[PDB]
Design a protein around this ligand. Structure first.
Ligand SMILES: CSC[C@H]1N[C@@H](c2c[nH]c3c2N=CNC3N)[C@H](O)[C@@H]1O
Ligand SMILES: CSC[C@H]1N[C@@H](c2c[nH]c3c2N=CNC3N)[C@H](O)[C@@H]1O
Lengths: 230, 230
């Protein structure tokens, strides 16, 4: 298959570009799309930019211009579940928006109009990625990642998000957006994020400090996954 | 020029489709795009779906697949500024997100990372549309429309939005998203919305009752504009 891989920032795509075989770069609508293969898998890498709109646009272009068959997001996120450490990797089995309120019409909190409440990562992708990781390794996690067009940096917002999604493991700004776009195109999706901060008052500082490492760790897990996907 | 016209719901695109000359429907990525002309202006009409992600995808496809030169959004919105009545039309000279918080990094509230706080409708488009309207008509307005991935239905949220953007006239769910996407593509944009409700506790009821009329009114203003734009 042909996999479209999206990262919000350059720090989150660098490692993958460095491991891209038969690399070629195409400029489309002012952005660079890296084509080639990874572990014999045809892929297209792109730095979308931050947020729902930018990531959604990248999905649309990957589908319309490159005819991708699947979508995978890699990058950083803020750790919110107790016990998750900076540097840990969270594989999203499900994604949802923590900043969406269309409840006046009867939708569940977080559920966008005309959309399901939860977007699910491809069951086959999730099954296989777990198989590539060790059960003895306690630094990777499988669970819910909540998305919003905000950088979470305070216990108050963390608590507010948890009141709606108590099982949330991490938070970011593109996960559910890419999953929503993928769902709209009937394309399988997977989201992988490494923790760059604790989404608290010190989040901006930790993010600045750990974005390079988080971007690399998330990408390393993706690379290991792709090599085992076959 | 070639103008891409986006409406979130069918009720907001119907009138335009009914007045599209040399109309033809095409299916791209599972959605219908209506090509044709409106007063010597080549156009592409599309019902994007609700929200930031859906509207952003539509902008991307309009640019990548149809090579549009400009973008115009039409539809319904909730009236928030005192005095604005249901049925009134608001032309957005500027757009901003009311639900974006990346302030931890120093951005102004509402400003998305890597983006300006305000997205501006094309100055030429704004100047010309005002010329097509009567100064004696008090039912059209020119000002700020704030966008968010939520349906505003309560004075509490209205007050919260006003605390950040006191001059906001109306609120909706795609304006700033379409403007952001257009800005990313360096394409001129214009947003026009007719009031379907008062964004208060009764907003869902008024929306249900007035979406057909609001969609029509907004489209009527756009049609008049296009017939005078030349
Ligand atoms: C500079 S905005 C933060 C970016 N990094 C991710 C992120 C890391 N840590 C957090 C993120 N997003 C929200 N809250 C957080 N605590 C998001 O998905 C954006 O692409
Ligand atoms: C069924 S979600 C509402 C849709 N109509 C517009 C709307 C009308 N009235 C309101 C809207 N959006 C937010 N708050 C409001 N009070 C938005 O842009 C969505 O496309």
């Amino acid at each position: 298959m042909k996999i479209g891989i999206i990262a919000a920032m350059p720090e989150e795509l660098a490692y993958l570009v460095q491991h891209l075989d038969n690399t070629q770069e195409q400029v489309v609508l002012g952005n660079t799309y890296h084509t080639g293969t990874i572990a014999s898998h045809e892929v297209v890498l792109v730095e979308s930019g931050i947020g729902k709109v930018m990531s959604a646009m990248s999905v649309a272009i990957l589908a319309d211009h490159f005819q991708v068959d699947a979508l995978i997001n890699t990058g950083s996120a803020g750790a919110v579940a107790e016990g998750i450490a900076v540097g840990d990797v969270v594989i999203a089995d499900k994604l949802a928006y923590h900043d969406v309120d269309v409840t006046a019409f009867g939708y569940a909190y977080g559920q966008m109009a005309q959309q399901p409440l939860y977007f699910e990562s491809d069951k086959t992708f999730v099954a296989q990625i777990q198989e590539s990781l060790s059960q003895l390794d306690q630094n990777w996690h499988l669970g819910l990642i909540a998305t919003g067009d905000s950088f979470v940096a305070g216990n108050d917002k963390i608590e507010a998000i948890k009141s709606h999604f108590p099982e949330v493991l991490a938070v970011e700004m593109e996960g559910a957006a890419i999953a929503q776009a993928a769902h709209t195109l009937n394309l399988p999706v997977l989201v992988i994020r490494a923790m760059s901060d604790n989404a608290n008052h010190e989040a901006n500082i930790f993010f600045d400090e750990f974005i390079i490492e988080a971007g690399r760790r998330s990408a390393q897990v993706l690379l290991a996954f792709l090599k085992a996907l076959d």
